[PDB]
């Protein structure tokens, strides 16, 4: 059943960072907080992984998956960034956004959106997300934990014990968390597209 780590929000214990990249490494499906409610997270190559993220999250047919980046120069090394995109992405980070780019090569196909090859690149502003990536060294593959059906993120480590224990191999407490979700802004096409609007202004893309 899953591990259950509970690391400071603003000082992450090191140790417990290095063993949920482990977990992560090893094929694991983990749960981890971020500016904008819990998440999952997996390794990018690994399929099966994926698969299980893809149930929990019964991610609507057509929804992106998401590669959670520590920063806009990883960022742009998995999906195709020009200077407009940069532009309108540089202040409005990290966090509070899921920004809907075309993938690169680097992108496992099966984690592109079949119909425009497009993925979710997001940049979280937390501590602990942020040292989680920094010990994996490359993105970790994502979906916002969303209660099923619902349009709020999960925010309580105990609530998603009870209804995840036996579903993922690690869930990280992070702190009681906000349950509005990120603003998704779509950025593929020449005029910003607001997916869906979350905790993130809108505003900046108008």
């Given at each position: 059943?899953?591990?259950?780590?509970?690391i400071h929000p603003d000082n992450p214990q090191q140790?417990?960072?290095?063993?949920?990249?482990?977990?992560?490494?090893?094929?694991?499906?983990?749960?981890?907080?971020?500016?904008?409610?819990?998440?999952?997270?997996?390794?990018?190559?690994?399929?099966?992984?994926?698969?299980?993220?893809?149930?929990?999250?019964?991610?609507?047919?057509?929804?992106?998956?998401?590669?959670?980046?520590?920063?806009?120069?990883?960022?742009?090394?998995?999906?195709?960034?020009?200077?407009?995109?940069?532009?309108?992405?540089?202040?409005?980070?990290?966090?509070?956004?899921?920004?809907?780019?075309?993938?690169?090569?680097?992108?496992?196909?099966?984690?592109?959106?079949?119909?425009?090859?497009?993925?979710?690149?997001?940049?979280?502003?937390?501590?602990?997300?942020?040292?989680?990536?920094?010990?994996?060294?490359?993105?970790?593959?994502?979906?916002?934990?969303?209660?099923?059906?619902?349009?709020?993120?999960?925010?309580?480590?105990?609530?998603?014990?009870?209804?995840?224990?036996?579903?993922?191999?690690?869930?990280?407490?992070?702190?009681?968390?906000?349950?509005?979700?990120?603003?998704?802004?779509?950025?593929?096409?020449?005029?910003?597209?607001?997916?869906?609007e979350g905790v993130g202004d809108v505003k900046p893309f108008?």
């Open positions: 059943m899953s591990q259950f780590f509970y140790r417990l960072i290095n063993q949920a990249v482990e977990i992560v490494r090893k094929g694991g499906v983990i749960v981890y907080p971020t500016d904008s409610g819990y998440a999952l997270g997996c390794k990018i190559e690994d399929k099966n992984a994926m698969e299980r993220i893809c149930r929990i999250r019964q991610l609507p047919d057509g929804h992106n998956f998401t590669l959670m980046c520590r920063d806009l120069s990883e960022l742009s090394t998995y999906s195709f960034v020009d200077n407009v995109a940069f532009r309108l992405m540089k202040n409005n980070t990290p966090g509070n956004y899921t920004f809907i780019l075309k993938g690169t090569k680097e992108v496992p196909r099966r984690l592109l959106q079949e119909k425009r090859k497009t993925i979710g690149m997001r940049v979280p502003s937390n501590p602990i997300a942020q040292a989680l990536l920094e010990a994996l060294g490359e993105p970790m593959l994502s979906t916002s934990l969303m209660l099923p059906g619902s349009e709020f993120t999960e925010s309580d480590p105990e609530e998603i014990k009870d209804r995840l224990e036996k579903q993922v191999d690690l869930i990280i407490h992070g702190g009681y968390l906000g349950q509005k979700p990120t603003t998704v802004i779509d950025l593929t096409d020449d005029t910003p597209v607001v997916v869906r108008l």
